[PDB]
Design a protein around this nucleic acid. Structure first.
Length: 342
DNA sequence: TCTAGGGTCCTAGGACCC
DNA sequence: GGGTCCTAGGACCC
């Protein structure tokens, strides 16, 4: 058989919502991210900023060297959720097979759909419109017979465009496709693959699944499959959040437990408020804490626990702080909850 | 340039159980 | 010796 998978990807989503809601930002370089004195990184940038080299996940200090006139914005996450929910409702008009990946992204399985003569190509275009019409935002799409190829294709004609890969086109597409474009093949894995001569899927096809199972475990089976267009993963639509996390990185590092405890005191009510939205009685499976040090090493401590409790989180942080800070500065502290299994 | 905050899934050693 | 929990860490995603 053969499925029809759309990947929809809004363009510069947070920035596109800021330019819609304040046209004064349209053609000057803007970006959502913390200030440099807040030691932030960029979340998303508009195209005027990207012309300078401004990218997502870039430290804000670098973003600012590349683009000295960059306007920084702290983000209005209710204004990004209203559009995300709106957009997901537009998806529902065409199919209930919606696997959201983030506020700005979602997979759709439109095989069994019947809205544009089963043309996945025209369903996406109609979805890419509509969104434009009702939200004044643009989106790009990818159409393919499997998830990962649909996601790659959604990058091909960005912004405000789409790209279709048919099963006929798949082996051609795959032959020079760099491995790093595969979701789940990030910096580390790609550098390891490059150091064996493996750069593209074409190179992996010339490999043996047995030896790949040795060098990467069940990741090597994933590499093998993806390099041949194999992606059996189904658009899920039933996925539920499993954890809640609240952490902050301070403008200056902290070196005294009194400072750490003061941070937790501001963090705890925020975690309670967000947990209570999805669990009014605050009953959980595990809770825990996170410290990130001056040199960037990270440690987490968490344990089964039945119900959110501030004092046990302070307690846990005290133990981690004494037992593993070793004199270093601390740049972030976080609280964490693991939700009950349901 | 100096490195976020939401999250996901995988691995692996001991504990615990058979 | 074979089977799940617990926990910490890490790569990766947006």
């Amino acid at each position: 058989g053969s499925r029809k998978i759309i990947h929809v990807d809004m363009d510069c989503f947070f920035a596109a919502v800021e330019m819609r809601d304040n046209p004064a930002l349209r053609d000057i370089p803007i970006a959502i991210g913390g200030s440099r004195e807040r030691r932030g990184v960029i979340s998303t940038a508009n195209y005027p900023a990207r012309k300078f080299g401004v990218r997502s996940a870039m430290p804000t200090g670098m973003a600012l060297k590349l683009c000295p006139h960059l306007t920084l914005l702290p983000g209005r996450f209710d204004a990004y959720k209203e559009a995300s929910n709106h957009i997901r409702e537009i998806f529902s008009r065409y199919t209930s097979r919606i696997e959201p990946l983030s506020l700005d992204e979602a997979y759709l399985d439109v095989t069994d759909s019947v809205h544009c003569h089963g043309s996945a190509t025209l369903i996406a275009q109609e979805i890419r419109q509509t969104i434009f019409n009702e939200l004044q935002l643009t989106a790009s799409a990818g159409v393919a017979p499997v998830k990962f190829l649909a996601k790659i294709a959604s990058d091909m004609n960005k912004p405000n465009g789409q790209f279709v890969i048919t099963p006929a086109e798949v082996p051609a597409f795959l032959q020079t496709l760099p491995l790093a474009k595969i979701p789940g093949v990030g910096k580390v894995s790609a550098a390891k693959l490059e150091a064996m001569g493996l750069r593209t899927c074409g190179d992996v096809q010339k490999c043996d699944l047995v030896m790949l199972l040795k060098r990467f475990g069940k990741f090597g089976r994933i590499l093998w499959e993806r390099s041949q267009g194999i992606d059996e993963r189904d658009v899920n639509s039933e996925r539920l959040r499993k954890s809640v996390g609240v952490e902050r990185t301070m403008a200056e590092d902290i070196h005294h437990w009194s400072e750490c405890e003061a941070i937790i005191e501001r963090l705890y009510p925020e975690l309670e408020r967000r947990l209570a939205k999805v669990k009014p009685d605050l009953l959980i499976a595990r809770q825990g804490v996170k410290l990130k040090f001056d040199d960037f090493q990270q440690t987490t401590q968490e344990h089964v626990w039945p119900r959110l409790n501030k004092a046990d989180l302070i307690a846990t942080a005290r133990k981690t702080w004494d037992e593993r800070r070793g004199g270093r500065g601390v740049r972030l502290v976080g609280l964490h909850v693991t939700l009950l299994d349901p």
